[PDB]
A paper describes a structure:
Humans have three different proliferating cell nuclear antigen (PCNA) clamp-loading complexes: RFC and CTF18-RFC load PCNA onto DNA, but ATAD5-RFC can only unload PCNA from DNA. We show here that ATAD5 has two unique locking loops that appear to tie the complex into a rigid structure, and together with a domain that plugs the DNA-binding chamber, prevent conformation changes required for DNA binding, likely explaining why ATAD5-RFC is exclusively a PCNA unloader. We obtained four cryo-EM structures of the ATAD5-RFC–PCNA complex (intermediates states 1–3 and 3′), in which PCNA is in different configurations that affect the ring opening and closing process during PCNA unloading or during dissociation of ATAD5-RFC from PCNA after unloading.
To assemble in vitro a complex of ATAD5-RFC bound to PCNA encircling dsDNA, we mixed purified ATAD5-RFC complex with PCNA that was preassembled with a 38-base-pair (bp) dsDNA in the presence of 1 mM ATPγS, a slowly hydrolyzable ATP analog, and incubated the mixture for 20 min. Two-dimensional (2D) and three-dimensional (3D) classifications resulted in an EM map at an overall resolution of 3.0 Å. The structure is devoid of DNA, suggesting that, in our reaction, PCNA unloading by ATAD5-RFC was complete upon 20-min incubation, and PCNA returned to the closed planar ring in the complex (herein referred to as planar-PCNA intermediate state 1). Indeed, we obtained a similar 3D structure to planar-PCNA intermediate state 1 by directly incubating ATAD5-RFC with free PCNA. Therefore, we propose that the closed planar-PCNA state represents a late intermediate stage in the unloading process in which ATAD5-RFC has unloaded the PCNA from DNA, and the PCNA ring has closed and is ready to dissociate from ATAD5-RFC, as explained later. In the planar-PCNA intermediate state 1, the interface is smaller (2,059 Å2): the aromatic residue Phe115 of the PIP box also inserts into the PIP-box binding cleft of PCNA-2, and Arg112 in the PIP motif forms a single H-bond with the main chain oxygen of Lys254 in PCNA-2. The RFC5 N-terminal α-helix and the α1-extension-helix move up and lose contact with PCNA-2. In the planar-PCNA intermediate state 1, the interactions involving PCNA-1 remain the same, but the N terminus of RFC5 and the shorter α-helix lose contact with PCNA-2, and no subunit is in contact with PCNA-3. As the most prevalent conformer, especially after a 20-min reaction, the planar-PCNA intermediate state 1 might be the most stable of the intermediate states.
Numbering used by the authors:
A (entry chain B): 178 to 351
B (entry chain C): 17 to 340
C (entry chain A): 868 to 971
D (entry chain A): 1049 to 1098, 1119 to 1195, 1296 to 1418, 1451 to 1523, 1632 to 1844
E (entry chain E): 2 to 349
F (entry chain D): 36 to 363
Write the structure that this text describes.
């Protein structure tokens, strides 16, 4: 409440940049002699969106499960939509390949991932995707509109397919 | 007399009776037998086998007499808020059984219905009493559980059962139940279940009592699903007839079958990718149908949205005809 | 309890008995191979999905303050008071600052 | 070597030490001085022995915003006039039986010790002569364990002989409370007075600060004096923000950069980085995009649009303060700049309408600029909200809106800059289109670093107050429609007031001034003069 | 008071126009099965006058004995909202859309309370107490569903009269439970007759030409026509046939805004119109009315084929204005896009 | 004290529901076995669904036990499903005794009638499925909807589905004439025919409009004008004027016709409905019909969001005018 906030100095903590998470992760790795790869470190950092507790939990679960830090073991431990599949789907949408992009999307849907998880991974990959500025802007606009529809209650494979078709239409239209 | 459901009757009482998940089942058994069971977060779509997994685990850990005193099961939808976390859960986690020494188990089914503050206190209850009790949270959506509560637990995604592994147990229960089904019956069962063994057994059992024969047509008229022929004829009416004839025919079929427009869009979307359409036509149809499905969410006249759905195909009908 | 579906069939409507369409678009069904790339075959490099770089900065951060704020001399103090009074000409600076000096 | 907070270290011990609200301070001081005079005359009558005209009500009520100084003014006046405050907070169990049976005798009986260290003002809890004085602090805070508290303070109205002061922050408490009390309103103090006050307390700590940074901080926390004092204590005692020497006459360094620390922008930006230079320069690097998205996300959690609120300064376009191939190249620059600006504004409309906001706007009142919303009070119970909320949507929608806004801004800024470098050719042609590409900003949005709102909220609140005071007269109080009232009744009232003012300035009959009295309208004369001025 | 508040009819036989509709409203209350009403039409057509006439015909004359109460209601998020309510000894009147998205809350508890009020109060006059919901077209979907539930629950103890101007936003479940009362605007002759009737009671004789000018320039708004007649009475004692009708101040402000839009199409002029629309919005003028007046004066200054494009653009951005929490963004989006379209149109 | 004629004149008993043959037959054979399975009635509104389930309730129970041992809830509650879950849990836990003096004992279960069950989202439907499979023996449910496809597969699998067909206009006119003869109101057959036409097969809306017109007219004859303005329906003259303004090609007279429609109090959603009914049943080309109907759906969605009538109607009329003058 505002009367309580008036009597306290409020200090804003922001999300941890991935370099800081990487430094603490290598500090933990070098103090535990855990074999690793840069592939696995990037996978762990992707899975923990500015959450060092999540990064350490993912690292410890990966070492407890398999003992090797690579993206296969990391994304087996966390079980999220893999960013390589999302990258290939966004790349097919860039090339206006609606069939292959829908193949990836329907594979993700038949794997059972929730629409919120799919749209979150799509936004996270497209945020760092390699594309032009205007095309990225239209992609993020359609992703945000679709995510608003998901939050409002309408969530289905038709909505995600319409999002993919809109992303292809952004490439096919000047 | 008694006709118990086949969902309850054909339950995996032991951890070896699950069919699909085998890596995480081996991991869970290895957590059991070296006495290193952590806090679990079993999440996924319904009917995948999370409650069965945790009940077989608790049967492996505790006995029948101490089941009512050492493991406590809650449903968060019955009473949300911290009136149950600070209450039965806290008193269960902080007390000790008199002569039974060991660790307790809390099975919090439907954990995603829990409020944010109740989760903010449940995480602290987990942190303070880790040695005395272990917590297993069963939920459908991980997006409705705070990351602080997620990170204390080890996550386990129970994915939908693939049809290639779901068919053998369905055939086993078909052979045990002595039911006369055909191959299209199994195909319709594994198509409408969508990786849900509870839904599969419920639909198969209800079709068996409703008809005694379980074919494609008996399944589709048992669960009230749109027939494939109906959606194919709706596609034919949009693809070949004019505007008024298609409008009259589709409205008459909707009245005759009790068919909405949301499910028409749902089935026509799957028909769009199967039917050999050009890329531009496919993109236009998907965009238009997604907008029509969004416009149906708010209260709108279904007649005008149906006319819009016919219009979405009549826009590209002449284009496909002239393209040839 | 046993379930049943009751649909009051009217034979004159002719929509109850519907045959598959004979048009070539709904006859020839396109096939999707449902084949996807294997996920542990390509691999992920450093900085592919984040803002990570091989070079990490050193010496540009972790600068401890260790500040020794010297006491302001009298002339500088009245100069800053005159500066604040020029910034806010309608404020009563001379009747507040000595009282806050006593308060310190 | 100090153990005191700066609120109670720099607490005003005199009524002249408080900043702003001079009329309310004078009213309270006059009321307490009259009560002290009555007490001293009672003592003189006791020494001798051994009220419509006065109209001295036994109780004052004080209302205003949070942190403005109601309790501080009460304590300063009671210290100056020798009263002894018996305080009843919401932080102790104050039910009717306890408050009556444990504090009625302070009003009804003499002080047993009248001289000494009794000028110290205690509290109330139950797990030269000094006159007693009760202070009910935060009367709007009513719990269920405070059963019969309202009846108890009503008995305190009825049967007291020593003054009672009520402090509240709820604007509508004086409506529902039934009784007789002198009402005192604390208004929000001005920006510059509090800014100079904070500059004074910083200069006592041997720090030099600029007025603009303090004005940004005060307009950020809405002139909450205690909040700004405490954040100033945290920021000064931790070493200040950034070493930058500013030589000004109008010598030590200046310490600008407190507002960016307050919003948490220094946890994202490097100390060498500057927010204005970061937004003005073209961003290319991935880390720079991460910093921009984090900055915009930190501003979207507050539901404040950072870029559009400060659109003129952050754009690469000229900004002024308010007081044929050549033709084709002059027109194409303005056309492209207008096209990019229209594209950006369409993008912002897209984000406002078709993208989810993390905080559901118009939740308890309606949309902004409405006098019909009423008052929204915080909870008074110990029960949780117990309603379904989606945390993932609030986590993701802020980043989505931030990324889309950053990309829209970068596209617009790149388009306007790639229009602008060709203005040198038009300048060489002798024609200046920069008078059309300029932006005219107000002085209210120019004396601050960055703004959280692009409109005049003071003008909006003045218009709200005059709309409320027009339609609170007993003749207009029963008008059924409200927006139709301000769209049909109010413009005709403004025209009637304008014609009446023109008749008065024309030396006509004075009965025309009584036209509102002729139709028996009860609009106050200040409001009649306000409506008669203009329609700005 | 003014003639809009003093000469207002109170009985159902005193309503000058809509005599057949007033007679039907008179026989509506005789059966004793008075249902929920949905009184809709244009602004100032005579809606609230007819509700007061029906309320006077239902109860005694004590409905005119009015007072104002304030009620504080607790939201399910544990917050308190205070709202105002016109009340009498037999009826209630509230604008529930004053609580934003929490309108459903002041929809529920308030009618619950008044139902309990009719459970406590006994006078053997009427079985029900009528509550007047103003601006039902501004209620959200959750608010209208809660209203449907509340009307179905407390039908026997209290009655509802929904006064709106647009039944389009009103959900079909609500419209299927209340008797619809369409009150169209009075014509030119009706407004002239009512104006002459009101002016005769002041001892003044206005001409028919001035009354026709007042009727024409009011766009069939009887309240606005009567109030413009009040302004004309204030301006001059005799009513000349060429007496100047004073125009609305914000209307000429919007006119000047649209000439500023049309005259120059620059970013500086866009920011000037930004300041003008901000200063219009600070006066609590609704953005729909601003958009309608702006579109009308832009269609005044548009070409033939551009009128449809400008109108579709304005409707698009008005729907986006209703969708967004900050209506100013969509207002300037429409203004900037119209400026771009106008600059493109005049270039060839 | 009086009740509306919708509630007063619904059938008291099963087999008094006309034009439903198989549904009445299975409800009769369920009454004979005294066990009511889970029910799902789908069909157009005003077709006898609530009447049939209530008749089954009153004939299975007593007249004094009917209202106590059933619970009619509306499934479109805006506070989620958990509040409805609380009502069903409370009603299942609460138990009352039953005794009939006619010589037949009461069934042990109870009846929960969930109306507009199709408006529940699939998550809410799955949440309700737990309640109905956890209280199967002691509580029976009847879901009343219009579209069986909106009900999810676990619900529709365990329910018994019945489809209600609408009555013909002759039968509706006969029932309305019987109602008017019962309630002593002067009305010809033409007014009843226009009432049945203006209700569009909705007998509930027809009875509501007839009762409202009898209340409004004060004992006179029911003209066509009172039926027209009591149903909110724009007359066809204004629709023809709208289409003539669209075909003329003049935007000023288009604005005049739209402003005339706005001034008369007529709704914009009703105008969009009439325009759609005119457009889809005429001799326009398929491209014209497609563009006009897409714009009609967009305008209807915008009007449902709360947008102003005048601007949306002007935009829609501009689109229709452009599409009609494209042939010129
Ligand atoms: N892996 C499995 N192998 C065999 N039968 C299964 C399996 N998973 C589910 N079933 C069947 O499904 C029935 C119910 O499954 P449950 O485990 O109770 O569903 P669930 O995992 O709890 O999902 P939710 O989210 O709690 S509704 C069991 O009684 C089994 O008959
Ligand atoms: N006008 C002022 N002048 C000087 N110091 C002030 C002023 N207002 C607040 N302060 C400081 O802020 C501290 C706390 O202010 P309070 O008077 O307690 O605020 P308030 O008016 O009581 O509002 P509440 O009680 O928080 S709702 C005081 O002890 C002072 O140090
Ligand atoms: N087949 C029928 N037999 C007898 N009465 C009928 C029949 N169809 C409709 N009615 C009458 O139509 C009116 C409305 O029907 P109800 O069953 O009460 O409502 P409804 O059919 O459920 O429509 P809803 O609830 O809006 S979906 C009642 O007066 C019924 O008596
Ligand atoms: N039949 C009538 N005869 C005379 N004056 C009328 C009549 N109907 C309305 N009026 C006047 O016109 C005004 C109508 O305004 P009102 O009906 O309150 O607006 P709204 O219809 O927007 O609620 C009233 O002030 C009343 O004095
Ligand atoms: Mg389970
Ligand atoms: Mg205080
Ligand atoms: Mg019903």
């Amino acid at each position: 409440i505002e009367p309580i906030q008036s009597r306290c100095a409020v200090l804003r903590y922001t999300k941890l940049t991935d370099a800081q998470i990487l430094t603490r992760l290598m500090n933990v790795i070098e103090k535990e002699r855990v074999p690793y790869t840069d592939d696995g470190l990037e996978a762990i950092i992707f899975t923990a969106q500015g959450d060092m507790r999540q990064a350490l939990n993912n690292l410890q679960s990966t070492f407890s499960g398999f003992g090797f830090i690579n993206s296969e073991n990391v994304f087996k431990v966390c079980d999220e939509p893999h960013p390589l599949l999302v990258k290939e789907m966004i790349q097919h949408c860039v090339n206006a390949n609606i069939d292959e992009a829908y193949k990836i999307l329907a594979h993700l849907w038949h794997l059972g991932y929730s629409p919120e998880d799919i749209i979150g991974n799509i936004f996270r990959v497209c945020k760092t995707f390699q594309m032009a500025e205007y095309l990225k802007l239209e992609f993020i606009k359609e992703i945000g509109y679709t995510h608003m529809k998901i939050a409002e209650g309408v969530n289905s494979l038709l909505q995600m397919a319409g999002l993919l078709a809109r992303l292809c239409q952004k490439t096919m239209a000047p | 007399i008694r006709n118990l459901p086949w969902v309850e009757k054909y339950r995996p009482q032991t951890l070896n009776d699950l069919i699909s998940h085998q890596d995480i089942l081996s991991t869970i058994q290895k957590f059991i037998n070296e006495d290193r069971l952590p806090h679990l977060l079993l999440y996924g779509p319904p009917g995948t086998g999370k409650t069965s997994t945790i009940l077989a685990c608790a049967k492996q850990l505790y006995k029948d007499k101490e089941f009512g005193s050492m493991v406590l099961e809650l449903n968060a939808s019955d009473d949300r808020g911290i009136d149950i976390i600070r209450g039965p859960i806290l008193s269960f986690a902080s007390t000790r059984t008199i002569f039974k020494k060991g660790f307790k188990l809390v099975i919090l089914d439907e954990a995603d219905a829990m409020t944010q503050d109740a989760q903010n206190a449940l995480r602290r209850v987990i942190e303070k009493f880790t040695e005395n009790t272990r917590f297993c949270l069963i939920c459908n959506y991980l997006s409705k559980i705070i990351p602080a509560l997620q990170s204390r637990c080890t996550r386990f995604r129970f994915g939908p059962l693939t049809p290639e592994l779901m068919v053998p147990r369905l055939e086993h229960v078909v052979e045990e139940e002595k039911v006369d089904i055909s191959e299209d019956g199994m195909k319709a069962l594994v198509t409408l279940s969508s990786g849900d063994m509870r839904r599969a057994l419920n639909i198969l059992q209800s079709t068996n009592m409703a008809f005694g024969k379980v074919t494609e047509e008996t399944v589709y008229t048992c669960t009230g699903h749109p027939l494939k022929s109906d959606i194919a004829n709706i596609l034919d009416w949009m693809l070949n007839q004019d505007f008024t004839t298609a409008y009259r025919n589709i409205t008459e079929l909707k009245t005759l079958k009790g068919l909405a427009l949301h499910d028409i869009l749902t089935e026509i979307h799957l028909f769009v990718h199967r039917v050999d359409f050009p890329s531009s036509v496919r993109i236009h149809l998907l965009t238009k149908m997604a907008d029509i499905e969004y416009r149906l969410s708010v209260g709108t006249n279904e007649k005008i949205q149906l006319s819009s759905l016919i219009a979405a195909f009549q826009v590209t009908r002449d284009l496909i005809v002239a393209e040839a | 309890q046993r379930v049943v579906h009751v649909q009051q069939k009217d034979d004159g409507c002719c929509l109850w008995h519907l045959k598959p369409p004979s048009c070539p678009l709904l006859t020839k069904f396109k096939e999707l191979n449902t084949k996807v790339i294997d996920l542990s075959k390509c691999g992920i490099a450093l900085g592919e999905f984040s803002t990570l770089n091989s070079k990490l900065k050193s010496g540009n951060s972790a600068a401890v303050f260790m500040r020794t704020r010297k006491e302001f001399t009298e002339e500088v103090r009245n100069l800053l008071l005159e500066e604040i009074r020029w910034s806010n000409p309608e404020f009563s600076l001379k009747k507040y600052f000595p009282l806050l000096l006593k308060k310190q | 070597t100090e153990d005191m907070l700066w609120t109670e270290k720099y607490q005003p011990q005199t009524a002249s030490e408080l900043i702003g609200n001079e009329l309310a301070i004078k009213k309270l001081h006059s009321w307490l001085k009259d009560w002290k005079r009555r007490a001293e005359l009672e003592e003189r009558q006791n020494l001798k022995g051994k009220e419509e005209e006065s109209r001295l009500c036994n109780t004052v009520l004080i209302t205003g915003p949070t942190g403005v100084g109601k309790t501080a003014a009460v304590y300063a006046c009671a210290q100056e006039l020798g009263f002894k405050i018996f305080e009843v907070n919401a932080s102790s169990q104050r039910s009717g039986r306890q408050i009556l049976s444990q504090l009625k005798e302070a009003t009804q009986s003499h002080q047993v010790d009248k001289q000494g260290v009794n000028s110290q003002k205690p509290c109330f809890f139950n797990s030269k002569n000094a006159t007693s004085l009760i202070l009910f602090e935060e009367v709007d805070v009513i719990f269920d364990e405070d059963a019969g508290f309202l009846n108890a303070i009503k008995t305190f109205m009825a049967t007291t002989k020593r003054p009672v002061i009520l402090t509240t922050s709820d604007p509508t408490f004086s409506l529902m409370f039934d009784g007789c009390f002198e009402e005192i309103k604390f208004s929000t103090p001005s920006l510059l007075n509090v800014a100079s006050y904070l500059q004074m307390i910083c200069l006592t700590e041997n720090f030099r600060t600029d007025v603009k940074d303090f004005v940004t901080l005060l307009t950020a926390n809405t002139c909450d004096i205690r909040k700004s004092i405490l954040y100033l204590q945290f920021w000064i005692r931790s070493g200040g923000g950034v070493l930058e020497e500013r030589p000004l006459t109008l010598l030590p360094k200046c310490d600008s950069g407190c507002a960016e620390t307050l919003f948490g922008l220094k946890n994202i930006f490097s100390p060498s980085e500057d927010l204005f230079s970061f937004l003005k320069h073209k961003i290319t690097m991935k880390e720079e995009w991460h910093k921009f998205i984090q900055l915009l996300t930190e501003f979207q959690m507050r539901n404040v649009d950072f870029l559009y609120s400060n659109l003129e300064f952050i754009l690469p376009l000229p900004v002024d303060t308010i007081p044929t191939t050549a033709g084709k190249k002059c027109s194409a620059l303005v056309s492209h700049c207008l096209n990019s600006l229209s594209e950006f504004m369409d993008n912002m409309s897209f984000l406002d309408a078709l993208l989810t906001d993390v905080r559901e706007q118009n939740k308890y009142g309606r949309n902004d600029f409405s006098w019909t919303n009423g008052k929204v009070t915080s909870g008074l119970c110990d029960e949780f909200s117990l309603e379904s909320n989606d945390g993932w949507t609030s986590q993701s929608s802020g980043e989505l809106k931030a990324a889309a806004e950053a990309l829209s801004f970068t596209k617009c800024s790149s388009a306007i800059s790639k229009a602008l470098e060709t203005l040198n050719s038009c300048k060489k042609l002798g024609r200046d289109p920069t008078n059309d590409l300029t932006f005219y900003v107000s002085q209210k949005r120019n004396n601050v670093y960055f703004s959280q709102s692009a409109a005049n909220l003071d003008n909006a609140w003045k218009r709200i107050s005059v709309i409320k005071s027009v339609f609170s007269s007993r003749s207009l109080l029963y008008v059924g429609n409200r927006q139709a009232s301000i769209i049909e009744y109010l413009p005709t009232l403004r025209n009637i007031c304008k014609t009446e003012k023109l008749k008065e300035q024309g030396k006509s009959k004075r009965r025309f001034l009584h036209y509102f009295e002729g139709i028996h309208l009860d609009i106050p004369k200040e409001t009649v003069n306000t409506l008669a001025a203009d329609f700005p | 008071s003014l003639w809009v508040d003093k000469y207002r009819p109170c009985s159902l036989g005193r309503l000058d126009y809509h005599k057949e509709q007033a007679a039907q409203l008179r026989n509506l209350v005789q059966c004793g099965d008075f249902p929920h009403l949905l009184v809709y039409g244009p602004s100032g057509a005579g809606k609230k006058t007819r509700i007061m006439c029906i309320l006077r015909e239902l109860y005694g004359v004590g409905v005119e004995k009015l007072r104002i109460e304030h009620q504080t209601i607790t939201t399910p998020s544990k917050k308190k909202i205070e709202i105002s309510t016109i009340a009498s000894n037999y009826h209630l009147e509230v604008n529930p859309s004053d609580a934003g998205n929490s309108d459903r809350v002041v929809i529920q508890e308030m009618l619950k309370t008044v139902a309990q009020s009719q459970q406590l109060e006994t006078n053997s006059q009427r079985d029900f107490k009528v509550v007047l919901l103003t601006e039902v077209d501004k209620l959200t979907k959750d608010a209208q569903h809660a209203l449907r539930r509340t009307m179905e629950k407390y039908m026997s103890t209290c009655r509802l009269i929904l006064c709106c101007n647009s039944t389009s936003k009103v959900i079909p479940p609500i419209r299927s439970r209340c008797l619809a009362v369409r009150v169209p605007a009075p014509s030119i002759e009706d407004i002239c007759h009512v104006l002459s009737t009101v002016c005769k009671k002041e001892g003044l004789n206005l001409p028919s030409q001035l009354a026709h000018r007042l009727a024409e320039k009011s766009c069939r708004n009887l309240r606005k026509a009567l109030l413009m007649c009040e302004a004309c009475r204030v301006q001059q004692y005799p009513f000349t046939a060429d007496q100047e009708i004073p125009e609305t101040d914000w209307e000429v402000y919007l006119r000047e805004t649209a000439n500023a839009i049309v005259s120059q199409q620059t970013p500086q002029r866009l920011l000037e119109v930004r300041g003008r629309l901000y200063e219009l919005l600070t006066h609590c003028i609704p953005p729909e009315i601003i958009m309608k007046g702006l579109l009308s004066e832009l269609l005044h200054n548009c070409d033939g084929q551009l009128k449809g494009e400008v109108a579709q653009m304005a409707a698009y951005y008005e729907h986006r204005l209703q969708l967004g929490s900050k209506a100013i963004y969509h207002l300037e989006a429409f203004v900037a896009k119209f400026m771009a379209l106008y600059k493109k149109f005049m270039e060839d | 004290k009086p009740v509306p004629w919708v509630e007063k004149y619904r059938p008291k008993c099963v087999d008094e529901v006309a034009f439903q043959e198989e549904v009445v037959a299975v409800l009769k054979k369920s009454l004979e076995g005294a066990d009511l399975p889970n029910l799902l009635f789908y069909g157009p509104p005003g077709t006898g669904k609530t009447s049939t389930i209530l008749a089954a309730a009153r004939e299975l129970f007593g007249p004094e036990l009917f209202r106590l041992r059933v619970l009619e809830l509306n499934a479109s509650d805006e506070r989620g499903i958990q509040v409805v879950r609380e009502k069903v849990k409370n009603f299942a836990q609460l138990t009352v005794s039953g005794s009939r003096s006619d010589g037949k004992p009461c069934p042990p279960f109870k009846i929960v009638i969930l109306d507009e069950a199709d408006s529940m989202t699939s998550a809410a439907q799955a949440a309700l499925r737990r309640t109905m499979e956890k209280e199967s023996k002691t509580t029976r449910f009847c879901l009343i909807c219009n579209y069986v496809s909106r009900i999810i597969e676990p619900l529709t699998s365990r329910c018994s589905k019945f489809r209600f067909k609408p009555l013909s206009d002759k039968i509706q006119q006969q029932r309305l004439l019987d109602i008017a003869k019962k309630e002593n109101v002067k009305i010809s057959d033409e007014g009843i025919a226009y009432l049945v036409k203006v209700s569009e097969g909705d007998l509930r809306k027809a009875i509501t409009f007839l009762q409202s017109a009898t209340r409004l007219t004060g004992g006179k004859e029911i003209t066509e004008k009172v039926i027209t303005d009591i149903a909110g329906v724009i007359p066809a003259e204004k629709i023809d004027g709208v289409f003539a303004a669209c075909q003329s090609g003049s935007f000023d007279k288009l604005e005049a016709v739209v402003k005339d429609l706005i001034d008369e109090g007529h709704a914009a959603t009703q105008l969009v409905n009439q325009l759609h009914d005119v457009v889809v049943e005429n001799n326009l080309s398929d491209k014209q019909k497609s563009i006009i109907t897409e714009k009609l759906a967009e305008v209807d969605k915008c009007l449902a969001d709360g947008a102003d009538e005048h601007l949306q109607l002007i935009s829609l009329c501009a689109t229709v005018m452009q599409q009609l003058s494209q042939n010129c």
